[PDB]
Structures are given as C-alpha cells and as structure tokens.
Amino acid sequence: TDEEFDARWVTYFNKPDIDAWELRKGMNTLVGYDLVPEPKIIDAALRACRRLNDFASAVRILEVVKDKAGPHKEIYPYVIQELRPTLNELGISTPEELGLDK
Amino acid sequence: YEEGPGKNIPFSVENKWRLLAMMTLFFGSGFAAPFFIVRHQLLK
Amino acid sequence: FENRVAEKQKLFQEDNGLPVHLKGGATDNILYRVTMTLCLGGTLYSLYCLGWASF
Amino acid sequence: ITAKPAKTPTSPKEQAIGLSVTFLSFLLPAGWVLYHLDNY
Amino acid sequence: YQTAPFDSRFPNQNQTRNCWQNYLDFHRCEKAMTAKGGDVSVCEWYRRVYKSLCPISWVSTWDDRRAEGTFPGKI
Amino acid sequence: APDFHDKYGNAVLASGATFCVAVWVYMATQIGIEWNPSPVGRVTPKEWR
Amino acid sequence: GARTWRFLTFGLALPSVALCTLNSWLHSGHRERPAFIPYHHLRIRTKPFSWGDGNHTFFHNPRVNPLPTGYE
Amino acid sequence: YALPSYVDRRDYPLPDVAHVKNLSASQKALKEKEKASWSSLSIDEKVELYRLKFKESFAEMNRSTNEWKTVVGAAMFFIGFTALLLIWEKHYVYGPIPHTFEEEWVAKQTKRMLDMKVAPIQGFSAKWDYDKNEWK
Amino acid sequence: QTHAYHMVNPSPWPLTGALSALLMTSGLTMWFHFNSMTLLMIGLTTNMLTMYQWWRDVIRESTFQGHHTPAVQKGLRYGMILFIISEVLFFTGFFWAFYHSSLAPTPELGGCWPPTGIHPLNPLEVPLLNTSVLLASGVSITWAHHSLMEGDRKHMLQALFITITLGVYFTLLQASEYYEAPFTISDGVYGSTFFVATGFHGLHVIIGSTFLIVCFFRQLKFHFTSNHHFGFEAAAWYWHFVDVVWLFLYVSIY
Amino acid sequence: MFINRWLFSTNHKDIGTLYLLFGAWAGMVGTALSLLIRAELGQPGTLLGDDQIYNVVVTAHAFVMIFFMVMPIMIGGFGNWLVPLMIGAPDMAFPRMNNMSFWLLPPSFLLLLASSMVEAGAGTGWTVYPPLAGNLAHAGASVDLTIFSLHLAGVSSILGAINFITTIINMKPPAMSQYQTPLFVWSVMITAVLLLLSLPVLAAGITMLLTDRNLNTTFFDPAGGGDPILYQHLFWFFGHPEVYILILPGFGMISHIVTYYSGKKEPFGYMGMVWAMMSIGFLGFIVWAHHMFTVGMDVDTRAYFTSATMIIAIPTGVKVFSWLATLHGGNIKWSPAMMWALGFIFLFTVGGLTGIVLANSSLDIVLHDTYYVVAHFHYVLSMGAVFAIMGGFVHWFPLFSGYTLNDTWAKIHFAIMFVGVNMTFFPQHFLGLSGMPRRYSDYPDAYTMWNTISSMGSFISLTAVMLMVFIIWEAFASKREVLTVDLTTTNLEWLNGCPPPYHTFEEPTYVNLK
Amino acid sequence: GGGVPTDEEQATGLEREVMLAARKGQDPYNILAPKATSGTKEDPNLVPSITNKRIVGCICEEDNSTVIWFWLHKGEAQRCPSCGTHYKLVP
Amino acid sequence: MAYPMQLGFQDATSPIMEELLHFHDHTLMIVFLISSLVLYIISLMLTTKLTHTSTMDAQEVETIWTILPAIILILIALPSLRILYMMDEINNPSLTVKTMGHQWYWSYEYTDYEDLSFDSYMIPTSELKPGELRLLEVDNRVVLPMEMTIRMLVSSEDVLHSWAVPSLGLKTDAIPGRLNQTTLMSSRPGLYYGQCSEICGSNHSFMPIVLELVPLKYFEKWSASML
Amino acid sequence: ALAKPQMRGLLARRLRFHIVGAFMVSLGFATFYKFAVAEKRKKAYADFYRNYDSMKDFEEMRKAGIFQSA
C-alpha cells in the first residue's frame, strides 16, 4: 500500500543511530519517486537531521518538498502546516523565513 | 607522452592565434578543395 | 633442427626500451627503412602520376 | 558540467576577430572561384 | 490482328522473353511448315506478335546474325 | 549579479530581429530575384499562336 | 586421435587422389579443336587487355582459343 | 577528479560533500553551536549554516534566465548575415535567367497552359473561369 | 597493468600497409590506363614487406614475449572467425552473379544455359581430381592438428607437408586447366562468372598454402606447444574455408 | 614523439581523435560540394555550364558525406573514444590493426579526389550503375579510381567491424553480461555486424564492375548475356544495410544524451532498445529491392518488399517512444546537446515516415528518382545522422578535450542549423510530388520557387558550419578546464577525468558476481 | 614420438605468469569475476589494488542492466551509492 | 505538367494516377496522425516541473507500442497492395508502342501494322516558340489515342534511362537488353509531360517525353501521315 | 486549517489524462487533413467527370492550336 511504503520510510529515518550517509541516501532516493513525501516521513527525516546535528539539511529537505510539488501550489503550504509543531520544537526555520526563496 | 588538456591532440593550442591560423588552413583547405576541382575541370 | 626458442625469448625480452619491430636488432632497422622509403617514395611518385594525369 | 575560469579569457574583441577570420577562410576562396566562373 | 494479346506465359513487366519466343516461333514455324509442304502463311501470327513487341534494332540485329550464321537461338 | 543575458539580451534580440527582417526583405524584393510565383490571379493570359 | 586421421590420410585420402591422378593423366591427350563461329556474345573486346597486343587473353592457348577473327 | 564532489541538482538535494570544506575560526564555533538547540541560533547563523552546506538554494538553482533572447537574437543576426551572402551571390555569381521568364513569355505560356487545360481538376486550369475568360 | 590484455608497441606497419594499398590501387589504375606496371610492383613489394614484418611482430609478441594470455588468444579466435565470415560474404556475391546469369539466360546467349558455343569443362575429369586433392588436404591437416595436440613433432610435420603439397598440386592443376580451357574470361558471362569465381578461389588456395607454409617453418623452429598454437588453428580454419568454397563452386558453377 | 604518437598509434583515444579530425575535414569538403549542387539549382538555367561536372559534384558529395564524414565520425571517432571506456577495457582488441583502419581513409579519400581530377570525373551517381559507369560511357580512369576508393574504405570498415565485435564480446569485465553494456556499445556492435556482412557484397559488385571495365568480363553487359540489374541488386544488398549503419550509432548516442540531460540514471526500456536495434539490423538485410521498384520486378516481389520494408517502423517506433519515455519525469536540462537530440527525434521521425510513404511500391512509381526521395533521405540520413553527430560532439567535447564550450554559442549554432536544414529540404517534398527529377542540373520553369528557397536554406546551413568552427576555436582559445561532471555513476566514460589519461583501466574495474 | 614443447616448458612473460598463478588458485590479472561477500559493514567486499584507488562497478540486483560505477579509495569502507553494499580497498 | 508553387501531385490523367492520389492522401493522413502524436507527446514530456527519475517498469507498454503501429501499417498496406494487384490485373491493350532511350533523346516505334518510328528531341531553349515550355517540349510528340488501354514497352540502346509521365502515373526504367512493359490509359485529350528519370550522363536533364492524346481517328490520321 | 491534497502519483495522473488528449488532438488534426484535402479531392474528381465530355474538351484544344496531330 501507500500505508506500507510510508511506514518503511518513517521507520528508516527513525533509526536512532542513522548516520549522515544514510540520511542523504534516504532523501536522494525518496525524491526520485512520483510523489511528494507525507508529513510523517518528512517529520522523521527532520528529526534525523536533529540527531545528526544537521540544520542545513533540514532546510534543504523542506525546499525539496516544495520542489517535488511542481505547479501544485497547495501541497507545500499544507505540509508546512502539518510540520509546524516539529518546526517550532526543533527551531527549524523555513526557506521562506530565511529568504532562501528569492 | 604528454597528458591532459591541450596535450592529447596532434595540434597545439599554446597560442590561440596560431591555433586560429592552423584551424583556418585545416578547415578552409577542405572547404576550398571542391571549388578548385571545379575550376580545374572547367579550365579543361 | 634444435629448439632455440629460449634464446629468442631472452633477446625479445631484453630490457632495452626498443619497440618490438626493431628489437631483433640492426637488420630490423634496415628492413624498416627500406619499407618506409619505398612507401613514401612510391607515394610521392603516385602524386606525380596524378599531376601528370590531371591535364 | 562545471569548469574553472578560462585560463586565457577570450574577450568580445578577440571573438569578433576569431569569427571574422573563420568566416573569411570559407568565404574568400569559394567566392574567388564563383566570381571567376565565366573566366573559366 | 490489332496487337499482341496478353500471354499467360509472360505475365510480368519484363517482356524480353515474350519478344524472343515469338521471333523464334516465327522461324521455327516457317521451317516446319516449308519442310512438310504445309501452309507457311500460318506462321504469320508469330511474325505479327514479334513485330508488335520487339524493338526494331533487336529484330534487325537478330536478322543480321541469322544471315551471318551467328544467331545463337535454336531454329 | 546580472549576467551577459540580463545586460545585452533585449538589445541582441531586438536588433537581431530587425536586421534579419530588413536584409531578407531587401534580398527578396530589391535585387531582381525572379521567384516565379503562380500566375493564378496575377497574370493576364496572352495570345500565343 | 592422430592415428585415426593418419589412417584416413593414407587409406582413403591419398589413394583417392592417386586414382584421380592416374585417370586424368591417362585420359588426357588433347581433343578436337572446336570449330570457330564468330558469335557476338563470345570473344568480347570492349577495351584492349592491358598486356600483349591487347587482343590475347591472359592464358591464351593458340590451340583452342580463337581471337575475335578466328584461330591464329 | 576521482574525489566525491558537490552538485546542485534538484533530484539530488543532499550531495556527497559540503559546499565549504575548510572552515574558519568562527565557522567551526558555529558548527559547535549547531549541536545545541537551533531556536538559539539567529536567522543570520541559520543562513550561514545553510551556505556552508550548500552553494545555491533551490530558488537560485531553478532561476529563469534571459539566455533565450541572446540565442534567438544572435541566431536571427546570423540568419540575416546569410542574406548578405545571398545578395553578394546574386550580384556577383549569377548571370541572367532564361528568356522564358520574361513577362510576355509568361503571359503567352499561361494562355497555352489554359488552352491545353493543364491541371483542370484542381491544380491550375481549375482556377480559370472559361465562361467568363478570367481567374475565378 | 593488472588485466590480461595486450597493449601493442607503437607500430609503423599500419601506415606502410595503408600506403601499400594506395600504391597497389593507383598502380592498377596506371596499369589499366597508362600502360605501366612500376607503381603496381612497388605497391606489391611494400604490401609483402608490411605483411612479413607485421606478422613477424605478432610471432615476436606471442612465442617470444609471452603476451598471448588466454583472453588475448580468445580475441584472436573471434577475429579470425569474423574475418572468414567477411570472406564468405565476398564469395556469396560471385555465387549470386553466377545464378543470376545461369538461371535466366538472356537472348544473346541463345536463351539457354550453357550458352550456345560454350563447351563447359567435364566435372568428372580434372575438377574431380581437384576435389579429391582439397578433400584429402582437409584430411591431412586434421591429422597434423591431432599430432600437434598429442606432442608429436615428426608426424605434425609430415601431415602439414602433405597438406601443403596438396594445395600446391591444386594450384598447378588449376593453372593447367586455365591454360587448356577452350573458353576464356572474355567469353561472355559464362567466362566471367567461371574464371572470376574460380580465380578468387585460386587466389585463396595460394594464400592459405602460404599461411600453412609459415606454420610449417614455425613448427620446424619449435614455436608451437602442444596446447598453444593459434596460428596453426587459424591456418586450418582458413584452409577448411578454402575447401568448403571449392565444394560449393564444384557443385554450383561446374 | 609526434610520429610515434600520431602516425604509429596503438591508442584508442588518439585514433578516435584522428578519426574526428578527418571526419570534420571531410564534412567541409562534403558541405562545399553540397553548396555547389544548390548554387547550380539556385536559379533556373546553367551556372556551371557543364552538366558532367554537376554530376561529378553530386556523386562526390554523397561519397564524401557517407564514407568520409559520417562513418569515420560515428564508428571511428565516437566508437574508438567511447566503446573501450564504456566497458572499462584498456583499449581495442587489435589496437595496431585499429590504426590501419584509420590510415586507409586518407588514401581512400585521395583516390576519390583523383577520380575528379583526371579525365572528366565520375559523373555516375553514388550508385555507380552500369552501363553509364562502364568503359564506353565513362571511358578512362575516373570510375576505376572511384572503385578503388571504395575498396580501401571497405577494407577499413571491415577490419574495424572485426575489431569492434571482438572488443565488445571479449573485453568486458568478467561479471558484466552483454545486457549490462550501454546502448551506444550495442549500437556499435550491431553496426559492426552489418558492415561485416554487407561491405563484402559491395566489394564483389564493384570488383565485377572493375573487371567489366578492364578485363572484358560481361557481368553487367547484355552483349555477353550479363544484366545491369544484377549490379543494382548487389549494390543495394549493401546499400540498405549501409543506411542503417549510418543511423545506428546515432541511435546509440541519442539514447545516452536523452538519458543524461533528462537527469536519469538509465534509458527507459533497456531490453526493448536492444531488441529494437537487433530487429532493425536483421530486417535491414531483407528489404533492398525497394531501391528498384521501377526496374520491372514481378508483382509478388514488389508486394513482399513493400511489406517487409514497412515492418521496420515497429522496432523503430519502440525506440522513438522509449526516448519520449526517458524524457518522462525528467529534470530536463536544456543543454545544447539536448537540443540536438530533440531535433533528431523530430526530424528523424519525419524522414522515417516519408520512408514509409516510399515503401509503397505503387506510389514509389511516381516518387522514385524524384526530389521526394532526396527529401526523405536528407531528413533521416543527412539531418538525423548530422544531428546525432552534433549532439554527441557537443556532449562529449569536454571528455575528449578537457575544455568546455560556450553553451550559448552552441545553442545559437543549433538554432541556425535547424532553420537552415528545414528551409533547404522541406520544400524538396513539393518538388518531388510535382515531378521534378533528381540528379538534374536544371529544371522546368514551374519548379523555380522551391529551388530558389532550397538554395537559400543551403547558405543558412553554411553559416552554421562556419560558426561551428569558430565555437570550437573559442573553446580551445579560452581554456575553461573541466571541474565537475554529474551522473558519473551511470556514465563510466567520464569517470577517469577530462581528458582521461593515455592509458585508462590499467587496473580494470572491480565488479562482483554475487 | 614427442618433440613438441609444452606450455610448462616454453610459455613465457605474462602468459606464463597467468598460468602459474592459476595453478595456485590466484588471479593477479583479473580474468575472473570476484565473488561477493554479504557486503555489510562487518563483511565488506575486499577490493584488491596496486594503487590507492580503484573503480568499482556494482550490479545491485541480479539482471539490472545498469551498472553503478564509482571510485573506491584507500581507507574506510565505502558504500555503493545505489544499494549501499560495502566495499573496502586492500592495496 | 507542373505549375508554379505546386505542393502535391500533378492532376491525374489516368484512373491509376487517381488511385495513387487517393492512396497518397490516405497515407499522408496517417503520417500527420503519427507526427502530430509524437510532437504533442514530446512537448508534454518537456513541460512539467513534476519528476520521476527512479527506475520505470517498461513491460506495461510492450503491447500497445507494437500492436497499434502494427495495426496502422496494416491500414496502409491493405489499400497499397490492393492497388498493386489492381494495376497488375490483366491488360488487354488495343495498341502497343515501344520507346527506346538514347543519350540523349527517345525514339518511338509503333509496329502493330506499319513500321512507324521516329526520334524525339528536346526543343532547345533558343528554338522554343512563344509560350512553349523550357526543357519540356519536343520536336515529335508521342501521339496516342485517348480512352484506350495502351501497352508501352520500354528499353534502351545504350545506358539506363527511365521513361516517366507523372500525370499518367508512369515510370518504367529503360534498360538495354530488357523489354519492360507498362500500360497507359488517358481519360482525357491533351499534352502530358515527363522527363528522363535515370541518370544517363551529361544531358539526363534534357531528354523529355511529351504525350499527345487525341481521339482514335486523329491518331490513325497522324500514324498514316508519319509513315 | 488547510485540507489534505493529493500528494502521490501526480506525474502519472497528468500522463493518464494528457495521453487521451494527445490521441484526440492527433486524430483531430489528421481528420482535418482528410476533410480539407482528401474529401475535397474526391469531390473535385467526381464533379469534374460526372458530365465530362472528352470530345468537346478535345475540340476546344484543337481549336486553340495546341496539337501536332489535328
């Protein structure tokens, strides 16, 4: 299912000792698919970035969620809404909040 | 043998004006040849 | 006849920097020169015959 | 592909020269011949 | 006689052999008829057919070769 | 930082387009090329016999 | 093995060649010179040969090969 | 050339190495700070972290350009230059065309083509009115 | 290097070979049109010299320098098979010419095959002897191959001598048959297809006999091992090709 | 060192380089010839005042573009450079014989140039049909020199075919199967098979023409019982496979280019691309007589050849749809090489479809030996092969030289060429439909407008060729050395740097068999 | 009779090196495909080399037509960028 | 003949050329179907920021990508082959005429009854009468009866030529030593022009064919007067 | 709160709709040619010949002087 694919990916990013190679491989693999990843995958990815002390890759992950949406301009706003508690809690600023969209 | 950019070629690219002259003789001799063949034949 | 392959093996594997076509020694260089000279001189002659036939 | 800056930049002037010499190398010999066809 | 009819032996665009066969048949027919005091005029059919189909230069050359003894067809 | 195309893009586009049209029109109409267009609706037939 | 092929070489191959040789070099002699007829499809000359007088084939045999005008 | 390298590619968002390899004094201090809460980093520091890891942002790497104007315009100039060659060709290479292109020849020829009913179903004579003795 | 392939020393023979081709071809042109054989003789001479030194160098590289690893040998196998395939297709064109003419004889021929006035060779006379000769030579070379693999110097040399003698016998026989034939190459398409097809085949017999001779002398000089002798295998493949082409010619063109 | 390196080479890269230089030179000769054809036809009447010369020019145009520009560039140039790299081989199987395949071409070209310098040249067409090309209608040396030119080119390509087949079968890593080699490697192997089988048949036919001209054979002379039509079968038995040989390596490079600039790690439907090239290779040998539908062939034979010829659209359509499906979902980089490839796909399809029109022997009655055929093959062959060559050349120039081109100048070059070739050749369809013969030095007055336009288009393409020479100079003049290349994980030829060292894969790749 | 040398007696240079190494079950000239290990961090594929880097091709799944190529450097084991299987250089 | 700015075929003069016109329309419609499908699909592929770069399953398209082209080919080949065999169906001609190619002119022979023959050369440009066609007119035209099935036999006395008349749908190579047949039938009187269509040397461009189609009675009158 | 939009299979979805579109347009474009060109041709031939009088056509050509034979 959709559900089973999602849960594999959430589980992947949740590995407590996930390393940096593994985080990059995860995200680079994921954006090859015909899909914008679900909030709960991105959530799990962001928290890996946290465990890995990697703020920049957290920002880049949000940019690539936007990018994968293409001309469908409702998916990014939406995923951000769903990520806000995690963004607030980890102090992850958005690309827009950083001026990285200009 | 010489290795690297500008070194794996039978022509020199040390000076771009001498290269220009060599490329111009090269391609222009090829392009001109038919017109001189035609001249040759008409003059027969 | 006797098997002298071992001698030719030592000659052709002598660590002297020569390419295989000259490694037999002095008579290689001769035959090479005769070959190349006939080839080039023959090619000159063929261009001469072309010039001649072109008119 | 990414590349290092030109080792020997070719300015617009130098390109205009390159281009002009290039074009005349094709155009002058052929034009000589075509102009003189009648003569042959 | 208007022109040479369709001949199922020679149904293709290459009609070389149709001309050839009718030239041969004219001369074979005349030979067989003249040997046996038969009506030579019957052979005229083949002459009409070959005259329609064959190029004049082919007829002329073959005629010259028969006169020469160098015609290679069997008559 | 502005690139080659930001600086010279519209000038290249405008004058190139202008040069191209002008020189082709001049070639087509001003130097005696006979295009041999259809006579239909253009030529008046004339007695030939 | 080698012994099989040696057997075939001396038992079948070379004897066959010896018999054909005997038969050819007994049934040779020389036979009747064919009569000449100047057929237009034979003795073709569209350009002179590049040897001899131009009119003789490379293995021309006066005995059995006529020229366009007949036997020599 | 054999070493892992950096790329900005939108389907390879996290490249094999960081944009900036060798870090100054303060840049290392900043990396140490990154290990504590990110809420405690400023906006400027978050951007600086960004730019140590990455060269261009998504928006930058995806930017549009004006290159099409240079390409189309330049092509059109070259095409125009070609017409100069053709003028030079018409003036200095070509002699006169055959007399059959004279206006009177064409007029006679056209009548003769209508008289033999050249292309009378669609192509040519079809377009001539034989009753009214004019083009349709 | 830690692969098993052969990086060949820079060589002049490709260039002398290519120039030898220029000289043979411009030579033939001079011969056909300008009545002179000098250029052609120079080209033939340069071609022979190139062939000798080039193949000399291949023996140096293999027997003497040890560069023919199994992977290299495997490549040469493919190369020789492919070379033979190209030669088969070359001959195919002459077989096509022969059937074209013979199955649809034109009026100039008398509308028949053989043409009027052509007296074909009798295939049960010398051409049968030619057949026995090449067949027997296919038998002898197979003995030579088996003698080599078994380690037997003397019998390899005997078998290979016999094979060569047979190829030379075929060549003398064909030269005599050419001389004796009452028709010539100029006797229309009958002569054309006969002499050009058998002629190329005869050229290939000469070539293959030469190749067997080189193998003979290399065997005399102990170059071949009981397990490594690809120059011999290639000469045998080429010779079987020569045999098979003759067989087709024998069945078809006679 | 210079002689050792450039005359006595045994190095696949340097040999590749030689071939590219020769091919580029030949292309200048062939373009000049083309301009001469189009200047003769640019207005009604006679420019050259000598139709034998016109015929000589047309004939040489074709041989130069085919035997000295396309084949040496695609197989000798890209083939030598890329194939070994793409399978991690240290060189070609027969690296010395490889050098002779190269060195046979200048003398071949010299023979051809000689043919046009002596007597009144070979005004025969590239088909060299007797009796026009025989010793009465073309007395003298010219035709013989042409035949010899073709023998030498033939030998060059036959030995090359042996070398590529051997290399591609025998010199892969031991874990790599043939279905784990890149498509360009497949396309070269298949082209090599076609060359190995087809060129000896041509060699046979032209040798027969040689003997009819000089040894009094009559293979093609009715007086001897020969048949001019035999020469046609043997020529086109080669000639059909030849047109596929001209496009196959272009198919290969297009797959690589489309894949790369779509940001993909692999082409869509690899197995189908292999199957399609093998199918085209095979079918390419059983269609030749569609070159002969007006010679007077039996109706069932015309039906067969019509049918068989059309079948080739099936595997070909699979390749076109698979290129589109590679584009599908891509991060599209609008590089100059990507533009060449997209232009290829479109222009090749148009030419392919006019081929299907001609496959119909009934309609071919009216289109044969007209400008419709000339339009067909200048779309599929001239533009298709040339666009693939340009694409490949732009795309791999940095690998071969270590320098980058100016991408904007390369895009301009593409745009001018695209206008030029369409203006030259699209109107030729109209000329053909309306009955203008090919191989004509002048035409009835009705055909003046389309000829005028076509000739104008030829000059635009001239401008593009001159610009291409400048663009290459500028790259060598400025010396922008390569830094990063992306997607090396699925483009092995790049992984040793730009340019790669003289010797690559001295240590072979390590590949497990699991 | 005999008289024909054997490879053991007369093979020389690289042919001889390859023959003698094969006897000992070694492949210094890379004629055979190396057999994979499980390829984990603990059981990495051991990649011999005569320098400090070598190109690996990884066929990630059997009958993939795409091979994944990368430089393996001396030092810590590296992972195929497609499938992650581990490879370690042993110079 | 052709006219200035013409895009497609000369108007049909014979039923067979009319067939070829309709079959060409049918086939070009298919050409346009295909080429427009490809162009539309290419720009579709090239116009979205959405991506999918992971491995795609190729087997799903195997069937349509081969079957639909196969069906389209059948839709071309059926009418193609019907016309092929219809053209070939038994000709019962009323008249046979031969033409021989030469360097550089055509001869004609009408030898059903009398031995009528003549040469036909291009009118040089300097000798054209006012309104006559450059490079097309000949001195002696091929006069033929309209509304009759005519067998034309074609050969050559020297090199290859090819006898073509576009408007009647005809093109038959002229090969020395070979007699090629085609059949000709005109629906209308008039003048119909063709040009040599196998390269035959320096004057290949300059040896046209002009058919003059008239009622039987005028053909017989002319025949008798050309003896 | 924003509702949850479709996030999976967007490229595939665009293709499924646009392929139907591609076939419609391409069929439309080809059928336009058949209508504007082929059907016009069929009609122009049938109408030309429906009451065509070849002898009358001949007499007009004769009167104009075009023929060698009449």
Ligand code: HEA
């Ligand atoms: C690159 C070279 C090349 C290629 C690949 C081809 C490809 C084909 N060509 Fe062409 N052709 C030549 C070069 C080539 N042509 C040359 C040089 C000549 C003449 C030489 C001379 O006389 O001098 C010639 C002449 C020639 C003739 C002879 C015409 C005549 O002289 O009267 C014919 C006849 O059938 C022909 C047909 C074909 C066909 C059917 C294809 C097919 O392979 C095309 C298949 C491709 C497509 C159809 C497009 C892609 C497919 C799809 C998008 C799928 C869907 C399509 C359909 C269902 C139809 N060609």
Ligand SMILES: CCCCCC/C=C\CCCCCCCCCC(=O)O[C@H](COC(=O)CCCCCCCCCCCCCCC)COP(=O)(O)OC[C@@H](O)CO
């Ligand atoms: C009257 C005048 C007569 C003149 C006629 C002259 C014409 C042709 C000459 C005949 C051919 C001679 C070929 C000799 C090749 C010798 C080199 C050789 O045989 O080289 C061998 C490799 O094979 C290899 O290259 C294989 C190389 C294969 C060569 C193929 C030869 C056929 C080519 C003929 C040319 C055809 C012309 C066609 C015309 C239409 C070496 O490897 P081995 O043998 O394993 O040895 C190694 C062991 O010792 C280790 O223990």
Ligand SMILES: CCCCCCCCCCOCCO[C@H]1O[C@H](CO)[C@@H](O)[C@H](O)[C@@H]1O
């Ligand atoms: C590509 C290389 C092809 C090589 C072809 C070589 C051909 C050699 C031809 C030599 O022929 C010389 C002429 O010999 C012929 O004519 C001579 C009289 O002039 C005779 O004495 C000879 O017996 C022979 O009939």
Ligand SMILES: CCCCCCCCCCOCCO[C@H]1O[C@H](CO)[C@@H](O)[C@H](O)[C@@H]1O
């Ligand atoms: C396998 C095919 C057979 C080819 C074998 C060729 C080798 C033989 C070469 C010798 O040929 C020469 C022919 O020479 C004979 O006839 C020639 C012409 O009348 C004479 O000049 C010669 O004196 C000789 O009598």
Ligand code: CUA
């Ligand atoms: Cu007669 Cu062309």
Ligand SMILES: [Cu+2]
């Ligand atoms: Cu074809």
Ligand code: NA
């Ligand atoms: Na003209």
Ligand SMILES: [Zn+2]
């Ligand atoms: Zn992997």
